[PDB]
Design an enzyme around this catalytic site. Sequence first.
Site, mmCIF file in Angstrom:
data_model
loop_
_atom_site.group_PDB
_atom_site.id
_atom_site.type_symbol
_atom_site.label_atom_id
_atom_site.label_comp_id
_atom_site.label_asym_id
_atom_site.label_seq_id
_atom_site.Cartn_x
_atom_site.Cartn_y
_atom_site.Cartn_z
ATOM 1 N N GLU B 58 37.444 74.424 127.849
ATOM 2 C CA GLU B 58 38.000 75.427 126.852
ATOM 3 C C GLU B 58 39.350 74.759 126.736
ATOM 4 O O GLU B 58 40.512 74.835 125.538
ATOM 5 C CB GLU B 58 38.460 77.152 127.752
ATOM 6 N N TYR B 94 45.991 80.901 120.792
ATOM 7 C CA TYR B 94 46.243 79.655 121.908
ATOM 8 C C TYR B 94 46.886 78.351 121.316
ATOM 9 O O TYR B 94 47.874 77.847 121.365
ATOM 10 C CB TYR B 94 45.707 79.388 123.564
ATOM 11 N N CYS B 146 47.256 86.133 126.712
ATOM 12 C CA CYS B 146 47.163 86.432 128.225
ATOM 13 C C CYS B 146 48.339 85.864 129.050
ATOM 14 O O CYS B 146 49.529 85.933 130.037
ATOM 15 C CB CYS B 146 46.018 86.665 128.124
ATOM 16 N N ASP B 169 43.198 90.239 135.266
ATOM 17 C CA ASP B 169 41.910 90.814 136.096
ATOM 18 C C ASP B 169 41.747 90.119 137.229
ATOM 19 O O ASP B 169 41.350 88.935 136.855
ATOM 20 C CB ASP B 169 40.981 90.826 134.949
#
Lengths: 264, 264
Positions: B58, B94, B146, B169
């Site tokens: 990622e 992003y 986020c 989270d």
Amino acid sequence: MKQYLELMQKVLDEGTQKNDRTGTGTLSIFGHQMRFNLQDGFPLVTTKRCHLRSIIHELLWFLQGDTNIAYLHENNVTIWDEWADENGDLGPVYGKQWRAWPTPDGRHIDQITTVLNQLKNDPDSRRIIVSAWNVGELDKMALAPCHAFFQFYVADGKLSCQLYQRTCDVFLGLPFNIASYALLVHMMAQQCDLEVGDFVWTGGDTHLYSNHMDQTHLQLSREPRPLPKLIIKRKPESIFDYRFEDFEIEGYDPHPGIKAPVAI
Amino acid sequence: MKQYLELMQKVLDEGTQKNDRTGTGTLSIFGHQMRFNLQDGFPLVTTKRCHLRSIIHELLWFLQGDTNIAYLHENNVTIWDEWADENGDLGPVYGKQWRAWPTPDGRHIDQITTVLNQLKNDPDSRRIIVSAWNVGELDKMALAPCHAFFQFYVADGKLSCQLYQRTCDVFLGLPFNIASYALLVHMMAQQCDLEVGDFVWTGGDTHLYSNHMDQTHLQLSREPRPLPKLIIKRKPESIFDYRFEDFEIEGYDPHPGIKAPVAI
């Protein structure tokens, strides 16, 4: 205030020696966070005399979205003079981004109204945010945003706010910075019929200039006094209708003011 | 890790009961900060088994700036499938903002290259920042950022980084989040011939979902183990030339993995 003095001491004890925009040396730390329960009193430093006049005017000015210093000048607020050009313009700084963030498709985003809309209809949202960090307009601003981004949060009928301050002159700017955002939280809360919660201050490059060391030691020798109480004399129809006279501070009994000399 | 477990406990002890995007209830706190001295070891949670495979892919994907999940899919990385459309697109999330933030005048700002330029020529800058919070493109993104904004800092030959995570989270996402940014700091530091400093994690709405309570108590009953060591087998010519195989973890001895059930 306890939180403020503890930060000063932390910079003194843990700060690393370096330099700023090439000029005066500094002692600095990176990454800090403190919390002010607004229910305990308005966070206006008492270990040195502070005034809210400029703070209030600047905030009302931010909320209006016009980045020309005309309004500030009419009220003898000169904190932005240093950065303004001949016409009194500063470029797309804070207010412009808060009220009219320009998009590539020709729109102007009102982040303040957006946030109020969210607090009213979706208070549990995890993205009730206002950002002044518009990458595409930084070069046009007289000053890159120092208070760069802030987020709201609602719980148990109280409104909280966290600010990310990328850079901070602990002695000269911080007292002003904390009071400004604390005032905004009170205004936002009043408009939303909410009680005030916590103001969470988060900083990036947090420093003390070498020529403020004696002043810092002096302030650290003083005992903090009970925080004052903010009084809002009127309840405006919206966040854009506040007036300078609507704000009053009660029970403010600070130690003498301390001048902050700056190099040029 | 100590810092991670202390946050879990804090949410349990101080968190307020509410709800998320309307679905599963949560216990949440607002505003938190923790620090990881990267010199003490790579911050990969040991109280439950974690893998770096998806994290690494990622990150390389973010750095390339292409927001289509094709690359992830080719490598069997499925964490973004949930948000991708039929064509595998996610909108300007992003990577697009990191590498090509669109300006109103038709330009695409490469924030990663900008930051590297600053670390190389102006390491004491108080605005070495990357922001994914592009207000004007939020509606087009499959997911609002986020990990919204991060800032770098250099002192005593070490590179530090602070991340502002607007929502988190704690059980499911945080372990992944910390490792991802820790990896980025190591890569950035290697490219700048600097030692790694601190990774400072700052959070906004930080929560634990009600259906992760038993899992959280289980993890809290486990003793953290020594952190592993990140090994970078190669030194690429630039931040955009890293390969999956360049990274290896040594001395990772975690407790058994714990599944994280999610409602739909």
